[PDB]
Every structure is written in C-alpha cells, then in structure tokens.
Amino acid sequence: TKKVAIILANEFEDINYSSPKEALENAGFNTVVIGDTANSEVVGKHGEKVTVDVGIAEAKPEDYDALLIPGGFSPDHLRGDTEGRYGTFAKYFTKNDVPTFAICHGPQILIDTDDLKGRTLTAVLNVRKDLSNAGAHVVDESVVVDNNIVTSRVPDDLDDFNREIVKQLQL
Amino acid sequence: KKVAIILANEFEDINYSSPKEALENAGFNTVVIGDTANSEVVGKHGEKVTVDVGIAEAKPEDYDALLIPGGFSPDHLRGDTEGRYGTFAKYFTKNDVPTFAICHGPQILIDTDDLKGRTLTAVLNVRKDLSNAGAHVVDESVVVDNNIVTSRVPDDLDDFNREIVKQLQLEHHH
C-alpha cells in the first residue's frame, strides 16, 4: 500500500488540507501528518483541527510514497524552523524524484530545496516572484505537472490538482 | 514630512504602532496606504487602523519615506492583481528614497526587482527569498544600506526606530 506525507503547521488553508487528503484516501492511499510534535494539534485559518502523526525530528522521508504541502500560512511557519528541517525533509522528495504536490503557498517550501532550477511550476500569485527567483519556469495555470512535481494556485483549482496528484500515485 | 505606510489585514500590530509613534514623536506625519481609502485594516492582535489613501490614488512622489510593517500584511499586499504595491515601492528603490521594513516587510521589496547587491536583514522565514532576489542577507538587529533600513523582529524595534528617525532627520537637515 502507498502512504503520503503531509507537512503542516498552524494556519494552513483548511480546504487545501481536507480536499486533497480526502481525494487521496478515497483512491486508497493513506496520509500521515508531519509537524513539530507528534500528537499535537494544529489549527487551520478557518478553525479546522488536525492531529500531527509524526514529529519532524523523527520523520523518515523514505517511508513515504509522496509529499503534500498544503498552503495558507502553514508554509511560512514551517520555514521558520531554525534548523530548516522541513526544507530538508522536502529535499528528499525533490532530489529523489518522488511525487511532490503543493498548492497555493505550498510551493514556498520547495524553494528551500534549491532543486527548482529549470522546473515548471505554478502557485498563488503572492508567491510567484519568489518561485521565479528560485529559478523555476513559473506559469499561471490551474494545475502544472513537471515530472514528479504537481502544483496548483488556489482552492478553485482543487478538482484539477486532485486528479493529477492521484494520477501520480497510480503511476 | 509624510511617511507612507503600506498596510493590509494581519499586520503585526507593534510593527505598525511602534515605528509610527517614533516617527510622529520626531515630528513626522504618517499616512496609511491600503486597498480602499476610509476602510479599516485589522492586525494579528486586533489593532484597528484606518486607511487614509487608496493604492489606486496613491502617488509615491508625495512621500518622504516608505514604511512596511510585517506580519502577513506584506503577503496580502503581494496578492494585488496589478502588483500595485510592488510598483509603489519601486519608486523608493529606484530613486533612493528612505525605505524602512521590518520582519516580513522586506518581502515587498523583492517585488521591486531592485535588491541585487543590496544588504538587508529580515525575519528568518523570508531570508532565503531575499537571498534568491540577489541581496546580501545578514542576521543583525538593524541594517542600514544607504536608504534601506531593515530589522528582524519586535525585539529590534529600539534599534529600528532609532535608524529610521535618523534617516529622516538627516533628509530634513535636522
């Protein structure tokens, strides 16, 4: 069976978590929330409460068949880690060409991998300049697939995003 | 004697209030520039601020300096469909006009495309983006690179406030 890591901090955009999570679990893929402390709760911008399954200190990227990075302000919080551990965890997926999914602000974390040069991505408008400066070919589409990397912009894109992330895991 | 303060919802309250009071204590007027004149923006901790001037009508030449408070306000400002806050800020970087940013505030400066070779600091969370923009990024309580003054976190505010006031006083030959 296949397992998707979801990296999460407070103030994620609720639907960016719940919608892809439900699409993945509907297709038969288990999800596992990675955050600061196992068995702590993080809380979305609109109040959704999510239990963290695995602490980032313990997390083994090699356990997972994909990574999902929900947006909101969760990616900004994650990038506040004084040891950069979320960027490092993400770098496993980018460096080894494992399916990697990010929506909205989520592509911020990918910047921290330094693996974006020559890759094609999209993201929410707020974050597109930063993706470009990291060396991505940034476009403005509802969903963009570059080999293993799937990105979308906003919640309105979720149908497209959800179809592509499931297709990755099937492949 | 007017300082522009570009502001959306979810600014870090003290990042707005503290530099504002330091500037007004030194004899400078502050003007809040936001999406809609007369509307209210609300800080992470509830502080309510009234917008004086709508970004559509704002003219950067009116102002002696630009202040960019942090929190998630700068991220909101970067969401403007026409990029009008970045464009507003470009006037200051292009013309070497005093420009002050704290915490996340320097994110907006990335949108000027004028950072290459400049020296700045910011909150840890945005340093990598400043680096990719071509800046020399340091970890100091306040950095002054000609016209650009940056600091990292609320603990830096005493240093930040000293430097922004000094910049302006020197502009006016005090």
From Swiss-Prot, chain A:
CDD domains: GATase1_PfpI_like. It comes from the Bacteria. InterPro entries: C56_PfpI-like (IPR006286), Class_I_gatase-like (IPR029062), DJ-1/PfpI (IPR002818). Residues 2-170 form the PfpI endopeptidase domain. Belongs to the peptidase C56 family. PANTHER family: DJ-1 PROTEIN, DJ-1_THIJ_PFPI FAMILY PROTEIN. This is Uncharacterized protein SAV1875. It comes from Staphylococcus aureus (strain Mu50 / ATCC 700699).
